[PDB]
Amino acid sequence: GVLKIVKVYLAVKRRIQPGDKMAGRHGNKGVISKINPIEDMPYDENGTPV
Amino acid sequence: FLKPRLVDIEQVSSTHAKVTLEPLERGFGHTLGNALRRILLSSMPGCAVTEVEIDGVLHEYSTKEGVQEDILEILLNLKGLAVRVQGKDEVILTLNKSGIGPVTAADITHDGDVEIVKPQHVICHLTDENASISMRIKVQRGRGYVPASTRIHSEEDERPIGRLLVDACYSPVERIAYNVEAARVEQRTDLDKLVIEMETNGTIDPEEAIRRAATILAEQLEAFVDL
Amino acid sequence: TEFLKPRLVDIEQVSSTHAKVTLEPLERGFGHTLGNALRRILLSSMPGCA
Amino acid sequence: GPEEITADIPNVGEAALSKLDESGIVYIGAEVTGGDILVGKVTPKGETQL
């Protein structure tokens, strides 16, 4: 019944957004909640954000 | 209400420098230093490559015959090319090269306003005697982080199937730390200094940066100064 | 490199002593950069008779 | 009847058929988004009876 078939291959690049699952090797799950500016990130005396 | 003014701006590396603000009253070193880091880390003018059109390349997922870098990876290398312009808000830099060896950032086409602050920066390698790469690197200027994703809404036929967009990472500032040490002017009760130690890709002069940063502060306060 | 100024500023008076000013549209993270920088000069350094 | 892969699709603009080649299949390297036509396909249905 099939005369011909066309397979298109799409390469999507998804980055990261609230709702994605993240976990360490230790059984700690998480859902990235907010994506915060570098300005508002807790920093040490040297000025390097976290 | 003695107002501050700058003092020795000590360049250390082409990367970072320490600007200082001498006559600061009590606590104003923190009130500013923090307020200055905010506009410094975030809103500053910067120019990062955006659109890269390469030779025979249809999309970022291929491999150029003759270079050990995947196209996706060469685009990422372009995002880290630090440049500066003067009278153009976009200039198109032409890169051509061939022969076995590295293609650095010094192999591009010089323009009146083009200054490559890191000529050794590796764009990609070249693995075959005759293998040649031509690329149109369209560099524009802006503020903040403009991702490749939001760029394809205006579009209106960016048909050039060859033209690759990358994410605009535009910004000179990397890491800002501010430290207030007590400054003793020959006669005064107690004053503080402000050491703003910054770190940069070299596309902004320290004083200029610290000025346009501080410019916006008062420019936003404008409305604030009434109702 | 054109920046963004606020608009609308409904000032809701509460009594006569205090008030809630409101400032709509500021760019990213500027709510703190302004709000915190003014809080600082309001609580500490001000003209006063005590 | 048989369904055709032809690039002639009822009620779509030139803007719709742009990203397709003469044969009706999207070009390699063409960036696409949601709703964009990957393969033009048309199937016979006769006498719509409107």
Instruction: Assess whether B66 and B25 both reside in one domain.
Output: no
Instruction: Assess whether B7 and B52 both reside in one domain.
Output: no
Q: How far is CA D33 from the centre of its chain?
A: 15
Instruction: Assess whether B165 and B83 both reside in one domain.
Output: yes
Burial class (CB in 10 A: 0-12, 13-18, 19+), B14: exposed
Question: Does A44 contact C at CB distance below 8 Å?
Answer: no
Instruction: Assess whether B119 and B202 both reside in one domain.
Output: no
**D4-27 exposure pattern, b = at least 16 Cβ within 10 A, e = fewer:** eeebeeeeeeeeeeebbeeebbbe
Instruction: Assess whether B83 and B69 both reside in one domain.
Output: yes
Instruction: Assess whether B60 and B166 both reside in one domain.
Output: yes
Kindly compute the dihedral angle of the four CA atoms of residues B39, B43, B44, B46, in this order, to the nearest 10 degrees.
Answer: 150
Q: Judge whether B17 and B206 are in contact, CB under 8 Å.
A: yes
Q: Quick one: closest CA in A to B61, which residue?
A: A11
Give the experimental resolution in Å: 4.1
Instruction: Assess whether B165 and B57 both reside in one domain.
Output: yes
Instruction: Compute the count of residue pairs across chains A and C with CB atoms less than 8 Å apart.
Output: 7
In this complex, the residue of B30, B43, B217 whose CB is nearest that of residue C27 is B43
Q: How many CA atoms lie within 13 A of B6 on its CB side?
A: 13
Q: How many domains does chain B have?
A: 2
Instruction: Assess whether B54 and B144 both reside in one domain.
Output: yes
Note down the domain range covering B107.
Answer: 46-170
How close A20 gets to chain C, by Cα (Å)? Answer: 23
* Measured distance CA(A31)–CA(D32) in Å, rounded: 29
* Measured distance CA(A41)–CA(A50) in Å, rounded: 6
- For the CA atoms of chain C, what is the radius of gyration? 14
* Measured distance CA(B215)–CA(B213) in Å, rounded: 5
Alpha helices per DSSP H over B106-189: 148-151
- For the CA atoms of chain A, what is the radius of gyration? 21
Q: Which amino acid is at B53?
A: E
Instruction: Assess whether B146 and B193 both reside in one domain.
Output: no
Chain A CB contacts of C32 below 8 Å: 40
Cβ-proximal residues to B211 (8 Å cutoff; 6+ apart), any chain:
none
Q: Domain ends where: B170, B185, B217?
A: B170
Q: Domain ends where: B147, B170, B193?
A: B170
Method for this entry: X-ray
Instruction: Assess whether B52 and B118 both reside in one domain.
Output: yes
Q: Tokens in use for B33?
A: 């230093």
Instruction: Assess whether B213 and B120 both reside in one domain.
Output: no
Closest CA to B133 of B49, B59, B51, B74: B74
- Give the mutation candidate from A34, A36, A39, A41 for the C interface (greatest C CB count, under 10 A): A39
Question: Does D29 contact B at CB distance below 8 Å?
Answer: yes
Instruction: Assess whether B146 and B183 both reside in one domain.
Output: no
Q: Judge whether B130 and B98 are in contact, CB under 8 Å.
A: yes
How close D37 gets to chain B, by Cα (Å)? Answer: 16
* Measured distance CA(B133)–CA(B69) in Å, rounded: 12
How close A34 gets to chain C, by Cα (Å)? Answer: 14
Provide the CATH number for the domain around residue B65: 2.170.120.12
